[PDB]
């Protein structure tokens, strides 16, 4: 019974037998933001928070703010329209995508040890297959996220981007890794890095394969995910819903996970 | 078992035996925004969406935007710090509150007929108790939302604020209603209007009782909820999570509910 499922869930939430895990980083001026080559493209802006009032002459009984905020800021969601490969989907925007897809079991692939050894670590199809053999098949409509514990760098932007003369160095997936996931008909793929692709994904074929391939198939991306170390490899539910921005290509989100405990 | 519950949930989402309802309105320049008396307070800004690129020379392979965005914009969450009565709660901010509380069963109180006949319709404690008598008691930690079908005016700000010479006219709770809900230890209160209080709440005692009393008790408010007409009175889970804005007083949200079908 669908209803007993929901009531059961409501009770376990209230009792804490199902724990809500906060998978989101702090959104503010110090939030790390993508930096692109300025001869390649314009930058998304840094986050600004402007006071309107704080129990004062501008607003006696209340405190509130407004913001300068890019769609693609902090922990955030990538809609298919965000990439040329997904431009023609009429349901590829934040205000037109199908919300039934947004909530699903999540596969948490732990690559944190590898990531620390090599900042340019790449998750491959063979490695995903190995993970499947240990933990279980990745299923249709499920979330797949790469845990790297990159969020430990979220307090310092330079370290979070981890760039040198050759560019950003941060972990991510190979092109074949993404193709293989898309053959499993997943809903989307997520990272704890600045974007869904490795830092060095500009020199990949195709460039930015996560972005390219995910959106080609009308699938979603998630970036700057926090606290994937508190999720199990299998069995959690990921909730990742963008603001309903008009013709939005993306949005910051409050990524939440449901885990047993 | 919590795990058997989560897996069951996942399966039912996939099969659509559990339906995800979008309770959020579109977030854009035409999104209705609160207007306050100019000799009383500064306003929160209208939403602006600005293009960064759309597969052009500003960004060849991608489309994205940035926004001018008030915390309190469209379908949105009120954190306790928003009111003077909640200013001292250290967990009263979008980034300090307890996400365990954010997902809970929702009581949907249908006031659409009365509201249609009386734009100034007030929901009272007595009316709420009669409601409880028919559908079941309101429980600790639960959401309570007032369905007015006000979202039908969302296409026209003037009709949505519904103001005349004496101010906004839109449905809301009495102080007695809010005081009663608080005795039930609810998590928070939501409306389909521009805010949690009736348009005429300024002349209430105390002024803006929803904002005042909810936040006094470290509770939450939701405003501009869409599609409450798609929800059942009982049995549904509401997910309403704010962006993790640093010291945020509130946030636009992508309100989503889980209903059986
Ligand atoms: Ca390179
Ligand atoms: Mn992005
Ligand atoms: Mn508000
Ligand atoms: Na006031
Ligand atoms: Na402004
Ligand atoms: Na590119």
Curated annotation (Swiss-Prot), chains A, B:
Pfam families: Cyclase. GO terms for molecular function: arylformamidase activity; hydrolase activity, acting on carbon-nitrogen (but not peptide) bonds, in cyclic amides; manganese ion binding. It catalyses: isatin + H2O = isatinate + H(+). Its cofactor is Mn(2+). Inhibited by thioisatinate. Substrate binds at residues 61-65, 211. GO terms for biological process: L-tryptophan catabolic process to kynurenine. It is an enzyme of class 3 (hydrolase). Its EC number is 3.5.2.20. Transmembrane segments: none annotated. It comes from the Bacteria. Keywords: Hydrolase, Manganese, Metal-binding. Coiled coil: none annotated. Homodimer. Involved in the degradation of the plant hormone indole-3-acetic acid (IAA). Catalyzes the hydrolysis of the cyclic amide bond (lactam) of isatin (1H-indole-2,3-dione) to yield isatinate (2-(2-aminophenyl)-2-oxoacetate). PANTHER family: CYCLASE-LIKE PROTEIN 2 (PTHR31118:SF12). This is Isatin hydrolase. It comes from Roseibium aggregatum (strain ATCC 25650 / DSM 13394 / JCM 20685 / NBRC 16684 / NCIMB 2208 / IAM 12614 / B1).
């Amino acid at each position: 019974s669908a209803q007993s499922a929901l009531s059961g869930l409501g009770a376990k939430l209230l009792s804490g037998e199902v724990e809500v895990v906060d998978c989101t980083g702090v959104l503010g001026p110090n939030t790390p933001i993508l930096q692109l080559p300025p001869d390649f493209a314009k930058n998304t802006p840094k986050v600004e928070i402007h006071k309107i009032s704080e129990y004062d002459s501008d607003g006696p009984f209340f405190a509130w703010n407004w913001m300068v905020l890019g769609e693609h800021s902090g922990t955030h969601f990538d809609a298919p329209h965000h990439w040329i490969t997904g431009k023609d989907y009429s349901d590829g925007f934040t205000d037109t995508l199908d919300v039934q897809r947004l909530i699903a079991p999540v596969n948490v692939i732990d690559c944190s040890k590898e990531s620390a050894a090599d900042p340019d670590f790449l998750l491959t199809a063979d490695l995903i297959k190995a993970w499947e053999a240990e933990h279980g098949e990745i299923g249709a409509g499920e979330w797949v996220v790469m845990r790297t514990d990159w969020d430990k760098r979220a307090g310092d932007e330079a370290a979070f981007l981890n760039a040198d003369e050759t560019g950003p160095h941060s972990p991510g997936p190979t092109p074949d890794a993404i193709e293989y996931l898309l053959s499993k008909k997943i809903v989307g793929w997520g990272s704890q890095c600045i974007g869904t692709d490795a830092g060095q994904a500009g020199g990949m074929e195709p460039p930015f394969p996560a972005h390219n391939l995910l959106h080609r198939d009308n699938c979603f991306g998630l970036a700057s995910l926090a606290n994937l170390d508190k999720l199990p490899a299998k069995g959690a539910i990921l909730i990742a819903a963008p603001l309903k921005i008009e013709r939005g290509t993306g949005s910051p989100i409050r990524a939440l996970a449901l885990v047993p405990k």
